[PDB]
Amino acid sequence: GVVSALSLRERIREHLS
Amino acid sequence: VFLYHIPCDNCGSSDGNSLFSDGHTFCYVCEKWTAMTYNVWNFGESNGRYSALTARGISKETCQKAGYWIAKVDGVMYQVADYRDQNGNIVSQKVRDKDKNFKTTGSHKSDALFGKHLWNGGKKIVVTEGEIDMLTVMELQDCKYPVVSLGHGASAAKKTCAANYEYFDQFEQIILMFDMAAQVLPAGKVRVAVLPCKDANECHLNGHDREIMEQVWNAGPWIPDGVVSALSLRERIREHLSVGLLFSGCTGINDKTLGARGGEVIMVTSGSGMGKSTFVRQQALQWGTAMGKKVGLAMLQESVEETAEDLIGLHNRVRLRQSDSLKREIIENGKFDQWFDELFGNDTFHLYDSTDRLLAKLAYMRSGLGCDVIILDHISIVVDERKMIDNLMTKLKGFAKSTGVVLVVICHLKNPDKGKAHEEGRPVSITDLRGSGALRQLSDTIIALERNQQGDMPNLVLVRILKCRFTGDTGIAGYMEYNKETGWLEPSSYSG
Amino acid sequence: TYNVWNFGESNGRYSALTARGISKETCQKAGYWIAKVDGVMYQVADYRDQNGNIVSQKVRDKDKNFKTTGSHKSDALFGKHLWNGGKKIVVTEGEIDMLTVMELQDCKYPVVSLGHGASAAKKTCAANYEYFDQFEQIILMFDMDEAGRKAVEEAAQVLPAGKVRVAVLPCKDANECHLNGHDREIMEQVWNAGPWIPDGVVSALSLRERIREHLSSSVGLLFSGCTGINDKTLGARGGEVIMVTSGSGMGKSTFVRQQALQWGTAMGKKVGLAMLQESVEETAEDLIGLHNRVRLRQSDSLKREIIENGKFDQWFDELFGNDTFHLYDSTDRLLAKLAYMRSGLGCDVIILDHISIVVSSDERKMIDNLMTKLKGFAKSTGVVLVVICHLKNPDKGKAHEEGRPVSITDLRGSGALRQLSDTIIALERNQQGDMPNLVLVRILKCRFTGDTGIAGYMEYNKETGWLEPSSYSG
Amino acid sequence: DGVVSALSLRERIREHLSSSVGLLFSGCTGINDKTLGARGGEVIMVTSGSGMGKSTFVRQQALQWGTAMGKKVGLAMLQESVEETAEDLIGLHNRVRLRQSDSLKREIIENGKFDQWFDELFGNDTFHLYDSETDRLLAKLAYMRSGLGCDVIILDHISIVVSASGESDERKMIDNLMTKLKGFAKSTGVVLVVICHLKNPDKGKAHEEGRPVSITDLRGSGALRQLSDTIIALERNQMPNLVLVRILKCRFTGDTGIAGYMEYNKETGWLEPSSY
RNA sequence: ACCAGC
Ligand SMILES: Cc1cn([C@H]2C[C@H](O)[C@@H](COP(=O)(O)OP(=O)(O)OP(=O)(O)O)O2)c(=O)[nH]c1=O
Ligand SMILES: Cc1cn([C@H]2C[C@H](O)[C@@H](COP(=O)(O)OP(=O)(O)OP(=O)(O)O)O2)c(=O)[nH]c1=O
Ligand SMILES: [Mg+2]
Ligand SMILES: [Mg+2]
Ligand SMILES: [Zn+2]
């Protein structure tokens, strides 16, 4: 359930899309 | 017992054969001796052989005198051990193989031991937790001294050792070799010795078996629990002497707080929406990537991506969530990953995605990932509303104790009744913490934020220290000015 | 298990007892016989009803094991069928004792035996209350063990009063005194025994020496920092629970630690701490820094300095040379650890801290049971017990930390804390007022002297940590 | 059966009023005017706050009942041990502070006057003490009534005989203990004094500050005022020595309310009658 | 049969 900040490379731009 | 000598018949000697009181004779020359499953396995049916163990080292006579025999049934190899009674009959068996298939056949009692069917009188006794170490002590002592072993392990010592009391009462001194704690035995009698290896088998296989036998005859006292005398604090204090983390954003805080320590509870409060998340986010961003410490956040208000966008827009001194064209421009030119890599190359930040399930995740974050500062936000969803919050604060104080972690907790305030509200600039008191009255009893540092959004300066804030155990300096720390264009609030020099 | 074993089908035979000293006549009269089944000779006892109907067997083997033949009744007494009246009975614990008394009296006095032993004697004596009404004197004859004293104490409660008399024996019970030749000393215990006195009540004249012993004992430990406190407290004696309270972070632990240091380095008293707020190393460094009149943890440069020049051992040996201090490492197990700290180590002062985690269902019954257990532990021990507690939230008015005078009914959690604590001391200071280093001591409750109110004033030092007796006038 | 007709009862009613009445109190006159002394088979319940002197008054009444009348008195002090509750009565007889003076202890050891102080009061067998479950205590009291032959039974500090046992619901245990003690006092016909405590008020002042007590301020249950005969409350303020007595319930008489005023002595320990 | 003696 704990996700580190390194794996948010293709998630922030997916949220902004 | 020996009586006298008779002339032998096999060797034909005169004084070679010896007669005993038991009726048997023995010659020293010719070497001739005269005279679940619920099924106990027969010895001759399952091909019982007294083979000596080779890979660890146990003689054949010890396996004969102990009853630890190898079965060759069904083409595989089993090591059956036998548990007996005081009468001299087989009570139960234990089957062990390479996969450790624990197939305990027969009536396995709750007070089953090993090696008690031969020994009733004596002075010393050695109790072990396994069977290989017990046979190893029998190898070192040539199978002549009283040594027993538990038949259920060191996990259920409160049942096996408690049921057998009069058997251990017959001796003078009881020596334990469990782990390198059962108080049901009488006091002033039980000794516990310490070996420099894992068990006796490692000292046997690594030449330290002398350190077995030096600890048997010279074992140490009981020493029940963690009652620590003052003599045993020579090196722990010297290790503890060989640190306050600096509060970024204002220099007036560190002049009277001297930072935070290992096992330090910091509480952050203000009015309804006065910017607790922004201030704690600024402290997290200035502590994570600028000091080399690993920080674990647990922001429960927003999601993971939204606080990631906050952090990215904060560090680049812009306002990301306040313009759509600014979000659109940074992705069309490839500068988005440049903000990503220079901030997340060190991986000091760890976010949390969303009540006892939280404490295991905090333990997995602290022990596993190895962080130093853990931040919790929005306590209202987690928390009758008096017993739960007190139990939660007690569990977090116990988690922060003896770990070395800085625990930051964001809380709220209650609604006032008379006078002016908190949004107009009311000086907050210490007893305004809602939910309970124990939140100011376990917290070690309490910081309150005060600002007036409808007054003269809607971007001037005040920091108020309410509780400090380290120094004892509480009150107004200073003033800071908030930026409506970059988000970074700066230390000001406003005077009253 | 199966049925009542007949002597014909089990080869019954009445013989004597050489190893215990009983002839065959007594076992012939009673009915304790020997069966030859399955090779091993089994001993077996017979039970009868009031009329004489055989109802139960007790089968015992060669290796001290028990075997019941079926439903063992609660009114089963060994020897009840033979006697139906009399003025003086003797109740024995086991079964060989009754045969021994029959041997030494030539079958004259009505002597019976129990059917349960010392484990369930109260039930079988409550279920046999109607049988003991037709008698005139009852002589209890039990073992000279702790279980025997427990049986003769608790089983003599459901018996009629004025007819119960207890005899004593120098052996375990009467049979070894029969074997050791003490046949004359047991008959005087049958004829003239001691009545049902030692239940727990005492006489008004038997205390005359012991009140003298307490008169020759019980000196109060003088407090430090203020001489106005000792003028209305007169120290702390054995069995004294002292409660300390103030607001949140007002100086409870600092004052208690200073009191502990002044009792340690100046009186030689063995002090046991149970500090649960912080661990062992922090309070150890606080004691070391406070003895040297500095603030040890509040100076990183001083901690770096004193470890280089080697003067840390000069401060360690002067404190922990005699090992007068004994610390604790962090619910019912705490009582056992404090019992081992008192009895096994030999301390005189026991200090706890922050009782709210210890009481962390309904908290009121838990804190009442906890205070009852600590009061019972302080009773009959002779130890000073210092307990630190906190306060609750006031409804209206100002806060407790802002210099508000605190009342005795502000102790949180329950009202049972002030009902058992002897001396309650509250601390008052105002951190937001004029002087945040001037404190006030308030005696809220005092069972011994009875003088309550403001004791004195002390001034706190921000540099050395030693608060001093001031001379302020309110 | 228990169907006793009223006609065959003339001799029992004639002998019932022949035996009793008496055992006057001490300290105040209004207590004797409103309660008319303590009688056999009654339940006297003395209430106060915390450390308000609820034990000193009962020990002073016990001294006046054991000295001036010679009645056999059985005490059950669970607040302190028997080494102290028999010590303070000597100082109360000799008008000094025996426990509160280290200098007088060595003086009565050396001069041997402690032997004379023990002989001048304990020459008779009128004091039966006890030191420390709930089932064996009533057996001790039955032994004191039947075997020892006591007249006044004092049960101090009831709050540790209903809380020291492991029970799910305490109130039914309090009810059972209260009705069994009432049945014991009815069957034996003995003077019985039982000391309890009060609870926390919801607002206002404290009971140690001059709060007027209510009858619903009893802590633990509501059977303490429904199965008792006389309820006596003590109140003072901390004039730190002006204590007043309130009769909250009297089943025999009807006059309740304020009985009077007493003053505490700091040199002798007696409770002198005040004037106000 | 072996080991030790004194
Ligand atoms: C009495 C006093 C203490 N102090 C400082 C020194 C103390 O170490 C610090 C408070 O630490 P503590 O003494 O530990 O406070 P506490 O025991 O009353 O309560 P808690 O631990 O639960 O918070 O306050 C002052 O600055 N001025 C003062 O006058
Ligand atoms: C009544 C009274 C007592 N005192 C003193 C005498 C004693 O030292 C102390 C109270 O005496 P105690 O009778 O021992 O107090 P208590 O019985 O009410 O306490 P608890 O409920 O916990 O058992 O206060 C006064 O100073 N002035 C007074 O008016
Ligand atoms: Mg503290
Ligand atoms: Mg009292
Ligand atoms: Zn031969």
DSSP for C419-461? HH-SEEEEEE-BSSSS-TTEEEEEEEEESSS---EEEEEEE--
Instruction: Show residues of chain B in contact with C316, CB under 8 Å.
Output: 234, 237
**Counting ligands in written order, which one lies closest to the CA of residue D92?**
2
CA separation (Å) from C220 to B424, C266, C331? 55, 15, 30
Structure tokens at C258: 């200073």
Nearest-atom number in ligand 2 for the CA of D264 is 29
Q: b/e map of C420-430 (b: 16 or more CB within 10 Å)?
A: bbbbbbbbbbb
Of B334, B344, B307, B309, whose CA–CA distance to B324 is shortest? B309
| Nearest ligand to the CA atom of C251 | 1
What one-letter code names the amino acid at B280? V
Chains that touch A (3 or more CB pairs under 8 A): B
> Is C1 inside a domain boundary?
no
Counting from 1 in the atom list of ligand 2, the atom nearest the Cα of C420 is: 22
Q: Which chains touch D (3 or more CB pairs under 8 A)?
A: C
Q: Among residues C236, C295, C297, C300, which one has the least CA distance to residue C262?
A: C236
Q: Per-residue DSSP letters for C329-388?
A: ---THHHHHHHHIIIII--SEEEE--HHHHT---HHHHHHHHHHHHHHHHTTT--EEEEE
C155 & C250 share domain = no
Q: Do C162 and C209 share a domain, yes or no?
A: no
Count of domains for chain D: 1
Contact indicator for D179, D43 with CB cutoff of 8 Å: no
The preferred substitution site among C252, C354, C427 for testing ligand 1, maximizing ligand atoms within 8 Å of CB, is C252
Is the alpha carbon torsion for C432, C434, C439, C440 positive or negative?
negative
Q: How far apart are CA C207 and CA B158, in angstroms?
A: 44
> What Rg, from alpha-carbon coordinates, does chain A have?
9
Chains B and A contact (Cβ–Cβ under 8 Å for 3 or more pairs): yes
Residues in chain C with CB shorter than 8 Å from the CB of D127 are 204
Residues C238 and C181 in one domain: no
Domain boundary among C192, C226, C259: C192
Shortest CA–C1' contact from B27: which nucleotide? Answer: E1
Nearest DNA or RNA nucleotide to B13 (CA to C1'): E1
**B402 interaction partners in chain C (CB closer than 8 Å):** 279, 330
Together in a domain, C158 and C295:
no
Give the C-alpha separation, A5 to B299, whole Å. Answer: 13
- C236: which 2 tokens? 């702390």
Q: Do B308 and A8 touch (CB under 8 A)?
A: yes
- For residue C401, give both structure tokens: 């930390």
Confirm if D207 and D201 have CB atoms less than 8 A apart.
yes
- Cα of D79 vs centre of ligand 4, distance in Å, is 6
C180 shares its domain with C220? no
CB of C253 shorter than 6 A to ligand 1: yes
From the CA of B12, the nearest ligand is 5
- Check whether residue C224 and residue C282 sit in a common domain: yes
Residue for token pair 């006297």: D44
How are strands ordered across the β-sheet holding C423-428? B227-229, C325-328, C271-274, C349-352, C384-388, C240-245, C423-428, C438-446, C453-459, C468-469
C-alpha separations of B147 from B113, B178, C148, D96, D113 in Å: 11, 13, 35, 68, 65
CA of B150 vs C1' of E3, distance in Å? 40
How distant, in Å, are the alpha carbons of C99, C346, C469 from that of C79?
A: 10, 52, 79
Q: Are residues C242 and C110 in the same domain?
A: no
**Which residue has the least CA distance to atom 5 on ligand 2?**
C450
Verify if strand E has an atom below 7 Å from the CB of B15.
yes
Instruction: Examine the domain organization and report whether C187 and C214 are in the same domain.
Output: no
Ligand 1 close to Cβ of residue C437 (< 6 A): yes
Q: Which residues of chain D have a CB within 8 Å of the CB of C196?
A: 143, 147
Do C201 and D146 lie within an 8 Å CB cutoff? no
* Structure tokens belonging to residue D257: 């309310």
Phi, psi of C213 (to 5 degrees): -65, -45
Closest nucleotide to B15's CA, by C1' atom?
A: E1
Residue nearest to atom 11 of ligand 1 (CA): B469
List of residues 6+ apart from D257 with CB closer than 8 A: D246, D247
CA angle in degrees (0–180, nearest 5) for B397-B398-B403: 100
Tokens coding C92: 């024995």
* CA–CA gap between residue B101 and residue B113 (Å, rounded): 20
C41 inside domain: yes
The position carrying tokens 């908030």 is B482
Whether residue D237 has its Cβ less than 6 Å from ligand 2: no
Tokens of B429: 């008191």
CB B125 within 8 A of CB B141: no
Note the CA–C1' distance, B35 to E1, in angstroms.
21
Interatomic CA–C1' length for residue B29 and nucleotide E1, angstroms: 5
Structure tokens of C304? Answer: 């770096």
Pairing of strands D73-76, D43-47: unpaired
Strand E bases within 7 angstroms of protein beta carbons: 1
Between A and B, how many residue pairs show a Cβ–Cβ distance under 8 A? Answer: 42
Nearest nt to the B11 alpha carbon by C1': E1
Do C227 and C373 lie in one domain? The reply is: yes
Evaluate: CB of D207 within 6 angstroms of ligand 2: no
Facing residue for C328 by CB, picked from B87, B227, B233: B227
Around B90, how many Cα atoms within 13 Å sit in the side-chain half-sphere? 16
CA distance C343 to chain D (A): 20
Residue nearest to nucleotide E2 (CA to C1'): B28
Residue C246 Cβ inside 6 Å of ligand 1? The answer reads: yes
B130 touches strand E (CB under 7 A): no
Cβ D268 under 6 angstroms from ligand 2: no
Cα–Cα distance measured from residue C43 to residue C62, given in angstroms and rounded to the nearest whole number: 8
Whether residue C18 is found in the same domain as residue C135: yes
- Domain of B323, CATH number, reads 3.40.50.300
Resolution, Å (one decimal): 4.0
Contact B438 C281 (CB under 8 A): no
CB contact under 8 A, A2 and B337: no
Tokens of C9: 């089908």
Contact D/B (≥3 CB pairs under 8 Å): no
d(CA B421, CA B430): 16
Residue D54 beta carbon below 6 angstroms from any ligand 2 atom = yes
Interacting residues of C276 by C-beta distance below 8 A, sequence separation 6+:
C330, C352, C353, C354, C357, C358
Nearest to B240 among C285, C341, C392 (CB): C285
Mutate one of D50, D56, D57 to test the C interface: name it (highest C CB count within 10 A).
D50
Note down the domain range covering D211: 1-276
